[PDB]
């Protein structure tokens, strides 16, 4: 025997010292294992969706900064932002999962969590769908973050989580459009994300505003069906016109509450045309497929390495 054969693969070698900052290269089986770990973590759909959104939603198309790479949600100041309060209570579990595994960055794991969330919400609505996921993100550390000569702004508003920091007479609807264009979303993709994320229970503070469904955590088209249902009549609750009550016209009962961010989807002609497609009988699969595309789009905004 002359030993001139192919080099045994690195996956077969018994031992190799841990790098103090490992390069990761998760295998398909690595990703599958992480998925099961996340699904069995006891994190809810809403939390899985929340933590994923919070990490990714900082992207600015204007200059191409922000997004889920680097995992700044785990660092200051993002970890402490009011709007991220719900998201951040899920981090410690992914942090532990990341350590036990050592197969992927925390940056990747955060987005994987969103993938698992959307998949579960989909099966709860009677659909098996594959949510695309690309590994490769890295974790930034606190100092690397502190030195950077660009600035990411704590958001005055994020309509996708029905968050509005203070009223200053810039309208909530225009602030939602601003966020959306920062993320380079089209009007249809913005529309699927809002409706999706509403019924998923992704409001920053657990409020029921715009949550037009009795089955939270299920990726249905409930939001759209109930928003366009003429059975309901919509009234402002006071002079601000920031908050609305939807009452059954047949029985008088107050069924829903809503903010301006929710109501605009039925109160602008273009958005409404989109909403009425998603409301359609038998448009559920189509909605789910547009929500997924939109969601994955947002999750990948900053992935210039996937050149």
Curated annotation (Swiss-Prot):
Q: What induces it?
A: By hydrogen peroxide.
Domain of life where this protein originates = Bacteria
Q: What happens when the gene is disrupted?
A: Cells are more sensitive to killing by nalidixic acid, the effect is mitigated by pretreatment with 2,2'-bipyridyl and thiourea, both of which inhibit hydroxyl radical accumulation.
Its post-translational modification remark reads: The N-terminus is blocked.
Q: Which family does it belong to?
A: Belongs to the peroxidase family. Peroxidase/catalase subfamily.
**How is this protein organized at the quaternary level?**
Homotetramer.
Its function, per the record, reads: Bifunctional enzyme with both catalase and broad-spectrum peroxidase activity. Also displays NADH oxidase, INH lyase and isonicotinoyl-NAD synthase activities.
Q: What is this protein called?
A: Catalase-peroxidase
- Source organism of the structure: Escherichia coli (strain K12)
Gene of this entry: katG
Task: Give the residues of the full protein shown.
Answer: 422 to 726 of 726
